[PDB]
Design an enzyme around this catalytic site. Structure first.
Site, PDB file in Angstrom:
ATOM      1  N   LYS A  50       6.391  48.083 110.986  1.00  0.00           N
ATOM      2  CA  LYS A  50       5.028  49.137 111.685  1.00  0.00           C
ATOM      3  C   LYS A  50       3.708  48.923 111.140  1.00  0.00           C
ATOM      4  O   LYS A  50       2.564  48.991 111.696  1.00  0.00           O
ATOM      5  CB  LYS A  50       5.869  50.456 111.571  1.00  0.00           C
ATOM      6  CG  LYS A  50       7.058  50.779 112.052  1.00  0.00           C
ATOM      7  N   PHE A  91       6.479  40.807  99.334  1.00  0.00           N
ATOM      8  CA  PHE A  91       6.516  41.074  97.968  1.00  0.00           C
ATOM      9  C   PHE A  91       8.126  42.040  97.675  1.00  0.00           C
ATOM     10  O   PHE A  91       8.969  41.454  96.707  1.00  0.00           O
ATOM     11  CB  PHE A  91       5.196  41.425  96.963  1.00  0.00           C
ATOM     12  CG  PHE A  91       5.961  41.372  95.826  1.00  0.00           C
ATOM     13  CD1 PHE A  91       6.866  40.441  95.166  1.00  0.00           C
ATOM     14  CD2 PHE A  91       5.541  41.955  94.692  1.00  0.00           C
ATOM     15  CE1 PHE A  91       7.029  40.647  93.483  1.00  0.00           C
ATOM     16  CE2 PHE A  91       5.905  42.399  92.999  1.00  0.00           C
ATOM     17  CZ  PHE A  91       6.921  41.553  92.668  1.00  0.00           C
ATOM     18  N   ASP A  96      13.697  43.434  96.462  1.00  0.00           N
ATOM     19  CA  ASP A  96      14.646  44.731  96.734  1.00  0.00           C
ATOM     20  C   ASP A  96      15.681  43.912  97.707  1.00  0.00           C
ATOM     21  O   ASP A  96      17.004  44.171  97.430  1.00  0.00           O
ATOM     22  CB  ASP A  96      13.415  45.990  97.357  1.00  0.00           C
ATOM     23  CG  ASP A  96      14.889  47.020  97.186  1.00  0.00           C
ATOM     24  OD1 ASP A  96      14.878  47.163  98.947  1.00  0.00           O
ATOM     25  OD2 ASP A  96      15.580  47.830  96.378  1.00  0.00           O
ATOM     26  N   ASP A 100      19.522  44.779  96.626  1.00  0.00           N
ATOM     27  CA  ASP A 100      20.554  45.812  97.440  1.00  0.00           C
ATOM     28  C   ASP A 100      21.689  45.252  97.959  1.00  0.00           C
ATOM     29  O   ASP A 100      21.504  46.034  98.972  1.00  0.00           O
ATOM     30  CB  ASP A 100      19.812  46.507  97.690  1.00  0.00           C
ATOM     31  CG  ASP A 100      18.587  47.965  97.207  1.00  0.00           C
ATOM     32  OD1 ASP A 100      19.031  47.342  96.117  1.00  0.00           O
ATOM     33  OD2 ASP A 100      17.916  48.337  97.432  1.00  0.00           O
ATOM     34  N   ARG A 105      16.671  43.157 107.928  1.00  0.00           N
ATOM     35  CA  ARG A 105      15.436  43.918 107.650  1.00  0.00           C
ATOM     36  C   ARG A 105      14.633  43.643 108.818  1.00  0.00           C
ATOM     37  O   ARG A 105      14.555  42.551 108.833  1.00  0.00           O
ATOM     38  CB  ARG A 105      14.593  43.023 106.169  1.00  0.00           C
ATOM     39  CG  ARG A 105      13.511  43.643 106.137  1.00  0.00           C
ATOM     40  CD  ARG A 105      13.085  45.241 105.776  1.00  0.00           C
ATOM     41  NE  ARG A 105      14.221  44.958 103.806  1.00  0.00           N
ATOM     42  CZ  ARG A 105      13.531  46.517 103.619  1.00  0.00           C
ATOM     43  NH1 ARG A 105      13.243  46.996 104.375  1.00  0.00           N
ATOM     44  NH2 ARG A 105      14.256  46.446 102.453  1.00  0.00           N
ATOM     45  N   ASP A 167      15.511  53.521  89.602  1.00  0.00           N
ATOM     46  CA  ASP A 167      16.610  53.650  90.402  1.00  0.00           C
ATOM     47  C   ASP A 167      17.503  52.841  89.922  1.00  0.00           C
ATOM     48  O   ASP A 167      19.506  52.844  90.154  1.00  0.00           O
ATOM     49  CB  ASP A 167      15.794  52.980  91.714  1.00  0.00           C
ATOM     50  CG  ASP A 167      16.779  53.081  93.762  1.00  0.00           C
ATOM     51  OD1 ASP A 167      16.698  52.811  94.498  1.00  0.00           O
ATOM     52  OD2 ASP A 167      16.872  51.032  93.467  1.00  0.00           O
ATOM     53  N   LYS A 193       8.680  54.617  92.527  1.00  0.00           N
ATOM     54  CA  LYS A 193       9.474  53.467  93.398  1.00  0.00           C
ATOM     55  C   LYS A 193       8.613  53.420  95.256  1.00  0.00           C
ATOM     56  O   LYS A 193       8.750  52.490  95.324  1.00  0.00           O
ATOM     57  CB  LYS A 193      10.418  53.314  93.536  1.00  0.00           C
ATOM     58  CG  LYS A 193      11.572  54.226  94.340  1.00  0.00           C
ATOM     59  CD  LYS A 193      12.902  53.717  94.932  1.00  0.00           C
ATOM     60  CE  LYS A 193      13.814  54.216  95.870  1.00  0.00           C
ATOM     61  NZ  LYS A 193      14.861  54.662  96.436  1.00  0.00           N
ATOM     62  N   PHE A 232       8.551  61.259 102.655  1.00  0.00           N
ATOM     63  CA  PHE A 232       8.967  59.888 103.031  1.00  0.00           C
ATOM     64  C   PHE A 232      10.439  59.214 102.933  1.00  0.00           C
ATOM     65  O   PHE A 232      10.884  58.339 103.508  1.00  0.00           O
ATOM     66  CB  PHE A 232       8.123  58.637 103.032  1.00  0.00           C
ATOM     67  CG  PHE A 232       7.798  57.700 103.293  1.00  0.00           C
ATOM     68  CD1 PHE A 232       8.529  56.328 102.569  1.00  0.00           C
ATOM     69  CD2 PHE A 232       7.326  57.442 105.219  1.00  0.00           C
ATOM     70  CE1 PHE A 232       7.701  55.326 103.400  1.00  0.00           C
ATOM     71  CE2 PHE A 232       7.791  55.723 105.989  1.00  0.00           C
ATOM     72  CZ  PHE A 232       7.979  55.342 104.672  1.00  0.00           C
ATOM     73  N   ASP A 236      13.623  57.937 104.526  1.00  0.00           N
ATOM     74  CA  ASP A 236      14.359  57.066 104.371  1.00  0.00           C
ATOM     75  C   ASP A 236      15.588  56.979 104.057  1.00  0.00           C
ATOM     76  O   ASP A 236      16.445  56.256 104.603  1.00  0.00           O
ATOM     77  CB  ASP A 236      13.622  55.378 104.004  1.00  0.00           C
ATOM     78  CG  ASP A 236      14.243  54.526 103.262  1.00  0.00           C
ATOM     79  OD1 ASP A 236      13.841  53.923 104.735  1.00  0.00           O
ATOM     80  OD2 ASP A 236      14.665  53.783 102.383  1.00  0.00           O
ATOM     81  N   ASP A 237      15.708  57.892 103.261  1.00  0.00           N
ATOM     82  CA  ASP A 237      17.465  57.860 102.636  1.00  0.00           C
ATOM     83  C   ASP A 237      18.368  58.126 103.474  1.00  0.00           C
ATOM     84  O   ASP A 237      19.021  58.063 103.704  1.00  0.00           O
ATOM     85  CB  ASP A 237      17.524  58.585 101.451  1.00  0.00           C
ATOM     86  CG  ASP A 237      16.654  58.451  99.946  1.00  0.00           C
ATOM     87  OD1 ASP A 237      16.393  57.179  99.491  1.00  0.00           O
ATOM     88  OD2 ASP A 237      16.613  59.110  99.248  1.00  0.00           O
TER      89      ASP A 237
HETATM   90  O1  LIG Z   1      13.554  49.793 102.605  1.00  0.00           O
HETATM   91  P1  LIG Z   1      14.362  50.080 101.472  1.00  0.00           P
HETATM   92  O2  LIG Z   1      15.280  51.052 102.501  1.00  0.00           O
HETATM   93  O3  LIG Z   1      15.419  48.803 101.555  1.00  0.00           O
HETATM   94  C1  LIG Z   1      13.729  50.949 100.159  1.00  0.00           C
HETATM   95  N1  LIG Z   1      12.688  49.983  99.286  1.00  0.00           N
HETATM   96  C2  LIG Z   1      11.971  49.772  98.031  1.00  0.00           C
HETATM   97  C3  LIG Z   1      11.064  51.367  98.630  1.00  0.00           C
HETATM   98  N2  LIG Z   1      10.839  50.943  97.467  1.00  0.00           N
HETATM   99  C4  LIG Z   1      10.412  50.035  95.967  1.00  0.00           C
HETATM  100  C5  LIG Z   1      11.467  48.798  96.377  1.00  0.00           C
HETATM  101  C6  LIG Z   1      10.943  48.081  95.405  1.00  0.00           C
HETATM  102  C7  LIG Z   1       9.802  46.870  95.520  1.00  0.00           C
HETATM  103  C8  LIG Z   1      10.341  46.400  93.753  1.00  0.00           C
HETATM  104  C9  LIG Z   1      11.128  45.926  93.892  1.00  0.00           C
HETATM  105  O4  LIG Z   1      11.038  44.703  92.378  1.00  0.00           O
HETATM  106  C10 LIG Z   1      10.263  43.659  93.324  1.00  0.00           C
HETATM  107  C11 LIG Z   1       9.186  43.896  91.685  1.00  0.00           C
HETATM  108  C12 LIG Z   1      10.550  43.084  91.646  1.00  0.00           C
HETATM  109  C13 LIG Z   1      12.544  46.152  94.523  1.00  0.00           C
HETATM  110  C14 LIG Z   1      12.300  47.954  95.441  1.00  0.00           C
HETATM  111  C15 LIG Z   1      12.445  48.892  97.328  1.00  0.00           C
HETATM  112  P2  LIG Z   1      15.191  51.297  99.277  1.00  0.00           P
HETATM  113  O5  LIG Z   1      16.021  50.072  98.393  1.00  0.00           O
HETATM  114  O6  LIG Z   1      14.294  52.030  97.343  1.00  0.00           O
HETATM  115  O7  LIG Z   1      15.816  52.547  99.555  1.00  0.00           O
HETATM  116 MG   LIG Z   2      16.645  48.725  99.956  1.00  0.00          MG
HETATM  117 MG   LIG Z   3      16.392  53.117 101.995  1.00  0.00          MG
HETATM  118 MG   LIG Z   4      16.388  49.808  96.798  1.00  0.00          MG
END
Ligand SMILES: O=P(O)(O)C(Nc1cncc(-c2ccc(OC3CC3)cc2)c1)P(=O)(O)O
Ligand SMILES: [Mg+2]
Ligand SMILES: [Mg+2]
Ligand SMILES: [Mg+2]
Ligand SMILES: O=P(O)(O)C(Nc1cncc(-c2ccc(OC3CC3)cc2)c1)P(=O)(O)O
Ligand SMILES: [Mg+2]
Ligand SMILES: [Mg+2]
Ligand SMILES: [Mg+2]
Lengths: 343, 343
Positions: A50, A91, A96, A100, A105, A167, A193, A232, A236-237
């Site tokens: 977006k 990045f 991630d 995960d 995506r 996390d 995060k 936010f 997202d959760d």
């Molecule tokens: O888009 P997502 O739903 O997958 C979210 N993604 C998200 C949100 N906030 C931070 C990150 C993030 C940033 C850097 C990361 O690792 C790299 C630094 C090496 C991993 C995850 C990833 P989340 O897994 O927390 O629900």
């Molecule tokens: Mg994720």
């Molecule tokens: Mg998420």
């Molecule tokens: Mg994550």
């Protein structure tokens, strides 16, 4: 809608981003193949979202720089820094998705799942990060805010990585984590995060570009923006389980991945001892019917209705904070961002 | 030996590095667990190597700063920047071990292979990188070289990642790569992936700290240091197969991983069409007896003797370059580094 106004121009600027991250190296043919892989990584992973985070830089820049000062070159520096935020997002998501164990995506297969990519995506991700600093240098090296921006992007990565670490520590694979899923923990995770980079970072970049570098001004903005970022992440959760995948562009893994999700925190706050056992026996496992049992439990405790109530309260709260802390900045900076994330 | 002189003091400084990367955040208890994971990552992954890259900063700093200018605080800044180079190495190796499917490093199991770590090590690696910039800020923010150092560390990461990208592209898994394994390609790979960060970076950091920031001085140093780094990588390739693992601390994977190793390049230059077929049928595969056939082929073409000859020639060459390009810097800067890597 000011975001929708500026979108076409923002996206169009991408092919210039990509040309410059390639034209930068026509003096070094030996690295030609590597540069072609870079282009391919940029194209797959910086496009299709977006663009809210990157657009926030540009929108905020317009509202904060006096328009006689918005010359051709300053605008271009603004779009470029906006694209640096999108590169940071790219990045983070590429890495991630590997950590995960994600499938899709932005509506397509995750970069690491493409045949022939796999764990090479780790290096791909870090090249995305490196691109940020190459763009800052190429476009902002002679500006009085250059160092502020570098230090802001670095500091924001560090905070985000500290967040991610919490996390992961809170969600060890193959282990019953329910005792650790508390509100206090949840709020820390998401502050670090998500909130710093997704909300503070882009507005702060635009503040610095407009020569607003004061500690108090940054601290005031940040009180607004970290609360918005917390909402936010809660949204997202919620959407991870209850959102429609053709809209979100991705399949949720939070229950399988044993995550300290807002949902599971809400669940724990409400469950009877019996329901606590269902959660325990079914959370954090790969099995589709276990996931489904958890989801049914969440629906049995009307967590979707709880989310809808919380969203209305959080919206009122954020607005109250804009009233308290926006000045001297235009309130439109924050309001346009709240419009993009609520409903 | 000037390296061996300075080692004890360098290593002892590590517990201060770790205290500062923790004392920095006693104002934020909520991130306590994450900081404990960070300490554990630092301890496992920044310790146990030879510290050549980090020590080079300190040794070079001594030889380049006039000693009346080597006060307590400057020395501490020097040891800290040396440790920043070691952190960058730790970042790179943790990620590289995952991508190369490695087993051991520095005589212990790779961080990602530890039970309970796995692909979380991706985030661990990036925290190591983030630490560099936090140390530079905490220790060098008010120094006239601060920005030079930040930009040098970033630029060095970028070059290294571009190198890695070429390394991976040249070695696709499950595919016969022999046509691509050429000398020209080999030299590019190693220049970018190893030579910049392992040799240019640490001496350049010390140059900047001593106020030597001139383009020509940096370019002269770099002609020496990139050639030394190329030899270093060729030796690393040789040792991957022929080194003793209780000395190297790691098990070699280059043949299995389908790598454009110096050895395979030398092999291709020498093999009969028949031997070319053996290589083809056996290179780049997981099977122990296939690996062994390749090694036997290399021994049949006396590649160990070829390496021994090349090492003597490269040593003469590097020395000739020190004669041509060292001034105005003390030649001892480069000579002490060559002593550490030859024989
Ligand atoms: O888009 P997502 O739903 O997958 C979210 N993604 C998200 C949100 N906030 C931070 C990150 C993030 C940033 C850097 C990361 O690792 C790299 C630094 C090496 C991993 C995850 C990833 P989340 O897994 O927390 O629900
Ligand atoms: Mg994720
Ligand atoms: Mg998420
Ligand atoms: Mg994550
Ligand atoms: O120590 P090793 O023998 O394993 C050598 N390791 C090495 C040498 N030069 C650069 C790297 C490196 C740096 C960064 C990497 O990726 C991270 C940036 C994301 C991967 C590898 C790793 P190599 O695998 O090239 O023989
Ligand atoms: Mg390796
Ligand atoms: Mg490697
Ligand atoms: Mg090697």
């Amino acid at each position: 809608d000011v975001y929708a106004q500026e979108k076409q121009d923002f996206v169009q600027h991408f092919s210039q981003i990509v040309r410059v991250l390639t034209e930068d190296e026509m003096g070094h043919p030996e690295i030609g193949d590597a540069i072609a892989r870079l282009k391919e990584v940029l194209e797959y992973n910086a496009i299709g979202g977006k663009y809210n985070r990157g657009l926030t830089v540009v929108v905020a820049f317009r509202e904060l720089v006096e328009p006689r000062k918005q010359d051709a070159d300053s605008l271009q520096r603004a779009w470029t820094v906006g694209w640096c935020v999108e590169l940071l997002q790219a990045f983070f998501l590429v890495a991630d998705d590997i950590m995960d164990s994600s499938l899709t995506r932005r509506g397509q297969i995750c970069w690491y799942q493409k045949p022939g990519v796999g764990l090479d995506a780790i290096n791909d991700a870090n090249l995305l990060e490196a691109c940020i600093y190459r763009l800052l240098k190429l476009y902002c090296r002679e500006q009085p805010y250059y160092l502020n921006l570098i230090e802001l992007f670095l500091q924001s990565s560090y905070q985000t990585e500290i967040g991610q670490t919490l996390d992961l520590l809170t969600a060890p694979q193959g282990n019953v984590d329910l005792v650790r899923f508390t509100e206090k923990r949840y709020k820390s995770i998401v502050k670090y995060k998500t909130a710093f980079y997704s909300f503070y970072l882009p507005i702060a970049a635009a503040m610095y570009m407009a020569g607003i570098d004061g500690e108090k001004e940054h601290a005031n903005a940040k009180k607004i923006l970290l609360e918005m970022g917390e909402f936010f992440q809660i949204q997202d959760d919620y959407l991870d389980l209850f959102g429609d995948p053709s809209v979100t562009g991705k399949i949720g893994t939070d229950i399988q991945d044993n995550k300290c999700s807002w949902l599971v925190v809400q669940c724990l706050q409400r469950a009877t001892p019996e329901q606590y056992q269902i959660l325990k026996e079914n959370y954090g496992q790969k099995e589709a019917e276990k996931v489904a049992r958890v989801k049914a439990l969440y629906e049995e405790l009307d967590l979707p209705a709880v989310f809808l109530q919380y969203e209305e309260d959080s919206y009122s709260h954020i607005m109250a904070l804009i009233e308290q802390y926006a000045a001297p900045l235009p309130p439109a900076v924050f309001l346009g961002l709240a419009r993009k994330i609520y409903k």
